[PDB]
Design a binder for this molecule. Structure first.
Ligand SMILES: COc1cc2c(cc1OC)[C@@H]1Cc3ccc(OC)c(OC)c3C[N@+]1(C)CC2
Ligand SMILES: COc1cc2c(cc1OC)[C@@H]1Cc3ccc(OC)c(OC)c3C[N@+]1(C)CC2
Ligand SMILES: Nc1ncnc2c1ncn2[C@@H]1O[C@H](CSCC[C@H](N)C(=O)O)[C@@H](O)[C@H]1O
Ligand SMILES: Nc1ncnc2c1ncn2[C@@H]1O[C@H](CSCC[C@H](N)C(=O)O)[C@@H](O)[C@H]1O
Lengths: 339, 339
């Protein structure tokens, strides 16, 4: 029986081949499926409702250089599941296709005020601003680096209809309302979902729509964390308490302040193809990445550490989202109006 | 290839043995499962949401003698799924166990005002009234015979806290509010669910709870009707447009006016054991039943017809609810508060 430290050591030293790494991670996810699936729908619902009840009771300086993100991710540095029509769809095309899918499903129209919560590097903000010149598009992020990157891109693209709010969304106070609120793979990070949804509703009028996209499991919810002491992966990728994977249906139970209008899922192979593209691009640009990171990180060892973390995230994400041809973990999307 | 009329003829003449009848009905339900299950969760949700959207767009003198109902059903003439703890649980015990389950899940407490919508022969009304003497319990039914039966039973049981409203619930207008509203296997008959839920909410205060129990399929919704021309069963049991079988999750999408607090399902073997008990009791009391019905129906042929209808309902219900050990069709229950 090998220890966590032992596996972690080989991992950090690049001694685990891709085939073995994939196999180890796939077995960890396998155990999560065993944990989450119950024998009867009666038991499945009891389990799911206990999770949802638990949620309702629940009341940092280092950032990657932009050149590094540019070398690993797609053109707009989307950090969320993309959408791949064809076998030959590139990550750049898949980003744009995802942006268009969100615009369709969130019913974006020219002239609307749009808020994007947890806007990342602002791919969606910039997409909407460029496509709908009479929209005013606000991104909200807790990262100064992200804000600065978005404002620079808007300037380069001659977009005059973009602003960015620098704020922790859980603390942000405002009387401003928006026609459209978008939340793309941000809710997974929210500690208090009920409060979050209530806050969003106060930023809506009776004409507004709220669109949420979140990674999910089709059947059950779980915190992203180790089940047992054999799981070296989960806590390596994310600290405890950071990420929650809701079931595809979980948000249906959070309609205190908003009302569902539509509900979709996107098969997990799209996410799998996304992380695969990132991993391959990082691999191709490995030497450049190491060069970019070295100044800010201080040693080749610290560099190798950051790279190992990102690359393993991609390798593991591949196994998670591709499990059973995309029919386990996937992406859920929901459209809401205000009550 | 045999016609519907041909199968119907043999059925009415008692020429189809139980084994063949069961097999024919089980194959009809099998085809419904093929119709309702989709290959991917993406497709399953598209199918389910299309059904729920369809619902949101949607805007007689003959009654069985009480002696007949008494000879076929359990002691309180419950016409809904019962709950069987043991292999030897009788239908009378299973009725009482169901009543207690509803009281627990609907959080009934002494002193509350309670409304039971579509109260049937009033088993639940009488149970609550007897167990909680400071509750005032109102049943609502569209049947004069049911109203009369309940009032007679309340008089015999020395219950002074029961009233019955004779009304079509879809037309009933009142400013009265109730602490608890119960809807046991009535919503399956409602043509406009959104309007129904909205009306119920107007009969609630901020302190009220609404408990709904409905037959369901765990995965998909369907109208109860023939898929094809080979289905002689569905339209024999119920006229087109009469009964809707919602998925176990369907009502989650109907929270415009109420908000979910809890959600359960009860495995289908409970319903199966219920209809099995009714069928066996009817069979045992067959000669008596024929005697009771003859005056009101006018001929042995009309009698045989009514009996065949009820008995086939039970035989078919057995195959439906027992399918895959109760893990296809079953009973859903939900608890709501008002928005
Ligand atoms: C459980 O695994 C997942 C976790 C989650 C995510 C994806 C996951 O697997 C593919 C998403 C998308 C994602 C993509 C690139 C990044 O890498 C730098 C990310 O980090 C900022 C994220 C973080 N998000 C938005 C939340 C958690
Ligand atoms: C699709 O099949 C079902 C249909 C439904 C029901 C049960 C079903 O199968 C077991 C329920 C329960 C039931 C029990 C005894 C009766 O028989 C005389 C009934 O009729 C008044 C009903 C009608 N309910 C309440 C609605 C439709
Ligand atoms: N409490 C909080 N307040 C504001 N932004 C937050 C936040 N917690 C996380 N975030 C932001 O939420 C985003 C999550 S990653 C998704 C980014 C973007 N929606 C995309 O699709 O690429 C990041 O921008 C992160 O900085
Ligand atoms: N529009 C309507 N208004 C009022 N009652 C209705 C109705 N449509 C159906 N009903 C009643 O709803 C009931 C459905 S059967 C279930 C009866 C009872 N809840 C039990 O569990 O035994 C019957 O009482 C039927 O008469």
């Amino acid at each position: 029986k090998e220890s966590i430290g032992e596996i972690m050591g080989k991992l950090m030293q690049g001694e685990i081949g891709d085939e073995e790494l994939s196999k180890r991670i796939k077995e960890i996810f396998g155990k999560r499926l065993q944990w989450g699936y119950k024998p009867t729908h009666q038991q499945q619902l009891a389990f799911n409702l206990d999770f949802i009840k638990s949620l309702k009771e629940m009341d940092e300086t280092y950032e990657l250089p932009s050149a590094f993100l540019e070398a690993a991710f797609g053109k707009t540095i989307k950090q969320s599941g993309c959408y791949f029509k064809d076998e030959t769809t590139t990550i750049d095309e898949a980003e744009e296709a995802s942006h268009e899918l969100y615009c369709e499903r969130a019913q974006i129209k020219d002239g609307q005020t749009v808020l994007d919560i947890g806007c990342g590097q602002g791919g969606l903000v910039l997409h909407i601003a460029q496509k709908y010149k009479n929209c005013h598009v606000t991104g909200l992020t807790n990262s100064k680096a992200q804000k600065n990157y978005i404002l620079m891109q808007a300037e380069k693209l001659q977009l005059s209809n973009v602003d960015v709010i620098l704020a922790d969304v859980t603390k942000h106070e405002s009387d401003k309302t928006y026609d459209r609120i978008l939340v793309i793979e941000t809710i997974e990070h929210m500690k208090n979902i009920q409060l979050f949804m209530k806050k969003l509703s106060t930023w809506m009028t009776e004409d507004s729509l709220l669109f949420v996209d979140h990674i999910c499991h089709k059947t059950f919810s779980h915190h992203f964390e180790a089940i047992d002491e054999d799981d070296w992966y989960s806590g390596f990728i994310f600290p405890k308490g950071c990420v929650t994977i809701l079931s595809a249906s979980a948000l249906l139970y959070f309609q205190d302040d908003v009302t569902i209008l539509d509900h979709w899922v996107v098969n997990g192979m799209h996410m799998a193809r996304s992380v695969d593209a990132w991993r391959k691009k990082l691999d191709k640009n490995m030497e450049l990445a190491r060069e970019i990171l070295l100044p800010g990180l201080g040693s080749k060892e610290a560099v190798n550490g950051v790279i190992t973390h990102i690359r393993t995230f991609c390798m593991g994400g591949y196994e998670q989202f591709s499990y059973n041809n995309g029919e386990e973990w996937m992406v859920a999307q929901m459209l809401f109006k205000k009550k």
